Design brief:
Chain lengths: 513, 103, 103, 513
């Protein structure tokens, strides 16, 4: 209460109790005033694959979505080595210690004061009535490292566009315009605070295990099958062979490898690659409304060893990389690659097609031939693994409401949700400057320049699956690198900059297929 | 209460329940000081069709009278297509988060 | 009961109550005698894409399946502008005022 | 119940009890099949004052609206001589003894049989959701005389039309189409019967009295007023005269005569009139949507004695007049005129304007002048009488639902009602002929020709006002004519045809103004 007493305390920790783990995190945020308190439509130019119609909004939004917001690199190691699965359960959100500050510029110098009576106004959208921009893997999340202070991103959305003469950017009768002040928000001065709770609906555990067997390798090698097939037509008579005696390709099997499609493969060594000034021409693409879009990422189809793909798998970067690009003779040291090769026991590899198939009918005078299938799709009796969740990856996504969807899991990995966590939106309440004495009906153009800052917290209850495995011998686990390095891993440098040295997937411990 | 805590919250929405509809709206306003805190009479000149005698006042007034203050263009569409009539019943007015500034 | 008194009344209307809508419809139908009271098999000729084997039956069947049987064009307009979804729940079927005539 | 026993009995009578009178009436009706069970739109041709768009309907309707359906000429005499007012209260409606008959034509002869299993279907519209065609003074009501058998009229309505190129008959986007089978009617075989009840909302009594005094004549003649006026300007000085000494035009009065307008007057003697081949050019007219309409009847403005007007007052005809026209050197013997001359004590006469008014400002050198007002409208402090109800006139009308209306009483006379008696609609249920053996999806073209007949009854509870008047001398009352005539009045002739000899208004007894 009041100006003098604080509205909250700092909670950042992790609590491991039985099969539950409970993470708490707090950060300090800074909110500017976007668009001078205005809504503005934004649109592209001309015809092309990138054309858009939308609205930029004088609001800002908290995004905690990404994993390592909630986990320290030790808690992640501790999590992925000991357990076969994780899913979220509950979350708890709070804002406190709001303080609003005003800026004044005399000549060329700034003087920042503190306005005690100014407010900010915040609301969460529980019914998902606004366009949902989370789960799209944007920037502007809580930083990895608790001592960083970050600036909240601006909120905006974009909507249907339409075919004008030379312009596909022309709005359509159904383009929606949402005013966020038509929501019943909550106005907060410096003393009072904001809170709400949320509960996840049941989802399946994410599998933290790598398989112990290939599909084609599921059998007893010591005894042959009782099934018979036609091996040899020669000699004007049919010859049936019995499946067995250590010839694996011939066995009958109940299950078949998962779906996928080929993807162009680019060697990590730079000298062997073909010198293309862009990879857009060679990418896998899908098209919607007459315009083509890169297909990324595909199904978790691993490439060949020593190769990679164009946006086929996720990739990250350090804090050392600023700007839009980096380059090196091999994959740059700032780039953090991910690899799905743990899934090659079930999922299809990207370096060649799915299989062959019968090309033609035969007779005595024509030879049988076969043709190769480059792509595959879902068939009955077929199994696959979903893409892995990383420490730097997104936690969830919103399943779009549609008349149908198949295996609704995000292609970037995550937990697909019908009712995801509500977006949280915040704004600085506009304070006008001194009005004129004579009345004028026009809008107020000029306001008092001000910004706000405070602290937030996120507390998520995670459910996790125990690991019971009777394998004798030891398993691969995540360990720190063994070299003496100038900078300790997952730690600041001399200049004070926090650095993630590499991505960490959750699949180490094995499991029988 | 006090300087530190807010005196209200933002309500703008519409609720359609049966044969009642309930609209809420909020705006942010700015009030100057008119006439240097003075009352002044005002009057025209000469003879003609427009001639007047009156007083200008160091006061200001809230006017919500006009319709679209209370309805969004979707709520209006939703109203006029589905119904044969409308009349008002009750209203509720509030001011809050007053703050005074000197120049 | 009896020849003199009617076995039912005419119900065609629509009732919109909350999130339920209840449609009633009545029609007048005429049933001949098909196939002279006989079952007959029917079949095509030769080889081709259209070839069939079946039976024609001395029976007849009520089909209300199609939508606009149940909705007037105003009730449809009223339905599709105001709502995000529809599904059926229950149905109730009746025949009455049967009368048989000889030629 | 059953085919063998009857569903009702004959009630026609009148019961005078205190201040209530209760009338019962029954008739026998015959219903054909209109439009071969089809709805059809109907429309005019070209541009003009009469242009229309509407729908004819395979339905028929009972209309009891007109007065003498409910009253015999003796009950009317008994009513209008003894009482100062009447208003309706309740009504009760019944159908019974329905029987349906089918028609067969072999060669050129008809053979009518009786179909026991056929039905008719009937409903009343309580909520007034259909177009309301009653109160428009059409034909097809219950006959005056209980032994007549009548045929029910066809139901139809007409709706907005629109400006096509050369055609104003073109439908408009808002033209409404009503299907009467989309109403939940009631299906009736020969045994079962139909009934409903209705209750009138409070309305003012219709005044059965003629006034005992003129407006300008309300005063005490024996004493002069105390009010002074300016009689004479002459002599360079003002001269005030005191109102009184038996000069009536000069008196001040609190009230002024009612509204009206002039109307062209046509002498009953045919030789004095001007030979116009039509009166449309000379009629009083009002115009709506660019097309002109005769203004009939106007406010109850009596004409001069021995004159009449063009549709200024109601007019009727005998049963002897069939066809669209009758002519005689004077007003024909079949035509039944009505006269409002009882109202001349308050209402304005039609033979000249309402009054004079000041034309100009004056000075010493210009004389004062006045101009004459041909029309008048409603002013504060002004009184009038409504048009009288006759024995052959309509009882009520429906006040159209509108944002405003003034003194809502029907200009033809009657009781204006917000919620009038519900229309009653009836149809022969279609019975198809023998269908073909091979299925065909087209509509059934051919049906079994049939018609129905039965009896109806109407029982109305009337409220009426007692007459207490202390005038010494006797009053005018309605009496039968004093001549010996070949045919008794209000009675059949040799050929068996019932004849109303003249109209009868309700205003005989007087009342003080």
């Amino acid at each position: 209460d009041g100006v003098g007493q604080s509205s909250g305390n700092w909670h950042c920790d992790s609590v491991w109790m039985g099969d539950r783990v409970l993470t708490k995190s707090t950060r300090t945020w800074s909110l500017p005033t976007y668009n001078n308190h205005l809504y503005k439509q934004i649109n592209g130019s001309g015809t092309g694959d990138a054309v858009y119609f939308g609205y930029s909004t004088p609001w800002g939004y908290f995004d905690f979505n990404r994993f390592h917001c909630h986990f320290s690199p030790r808690d992640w190691q501790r999590l992925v080595n000991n357990h076969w699965g994780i899913r979220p359960r509950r979350l708890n959100f709070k804002l406190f210690n709001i303080q609003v500050k005003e800026v004044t510029t005399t000549d060329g110098t700034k003087t920042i004061a503190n306005n005690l009576t100014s407010t900010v106004q915040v609301f969460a959208d529980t019914e998902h009535q606004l366009p949902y921009i989370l789960g799209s893997a944007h920037e502007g999340c809580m930083p990895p490292f608790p001592a960083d202070v970050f600036m909240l991103p601006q909120y905006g959305y974009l909507t249907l566009n339409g075919p004008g003469s030379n312009n596909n950017n022309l709005s359509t009768p159904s383009s929606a315009f949402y005013c966020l002040e038509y929501f019943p928000s909550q106005m907060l001065r410096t003393g009072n605070n904001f809170v709400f709770t949320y509960e996840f609906e049941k989802v399946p555990f994410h599998s933290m295990f790598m398989h112990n067997q290939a599909l084609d390798r599921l059998m007893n090698p010591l005894v042959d099958q009782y099934l018979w097939y036609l091996d040899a037509t020669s000699g004007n008579n049919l010859t049936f062979r019995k499946a067995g005696a250590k010839n694996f390709p011939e066995y009958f099997r109940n299950w078949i490898p998962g779906p996928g499609c080929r993807n162009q493969q680019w060697n990590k060594v730079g000298t062997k690659n073909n010198p293309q000034t862009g990879t857009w021409a060679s990418a896998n693409k899908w098209r919607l409304q007459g315009r083509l879009n890169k297909y990324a990422p595909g199904q978790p189809n691993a490439p060949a060893e020593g190769f990679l793909t164009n946006a086929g798998d996720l990739a990250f970067a350090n804090a050392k990389a600023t700007g839009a690009t980096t380059a090196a003779g091999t994959v740059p040291a700032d780039i953090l690659l991910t690899s799905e090769s743990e899934t090659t026991t079930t999922n299809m590899m990207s370096n060649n097609g799915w299989g062959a198939i019968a090309s033609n009918n035969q007779n005595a005078s024509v030879a049988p031939t076969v043709q190769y299938e480059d792509s595959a799709h879902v068939l009955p009796g077929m199994v696959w693994q979903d893409r892995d969740i990383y420490l730097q990856g997104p936690i969830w996504a919103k399943i779009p409401e549609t008349d149908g969807h198949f295996h609704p899991s995000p292609l970037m990995g995550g937990f697909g949700l019908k009712n995801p966590p509500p977006q949280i939106l915040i704004k600085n309440t506009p304070v006008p400057a001194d009005p004129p004495t004579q009345f004028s009906s026009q809008k107020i153009n000029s306001f008092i320049t001000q910004y706000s800052t405070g602290q937030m917290t996120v507390e998520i209850e995670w459910e996790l699956r125990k690991e019971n495995s009777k394998r004798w011998n030891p398993e691969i686990q995540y360990t720190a690198n063994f070299n003496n390095s100038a900078n300790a891993q997952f730690s600041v440098n001399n200049n004070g900059l926090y650095i993630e040295d590499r991505t960490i997937g959750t699949r180490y411990l094995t499991h029988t297929l």
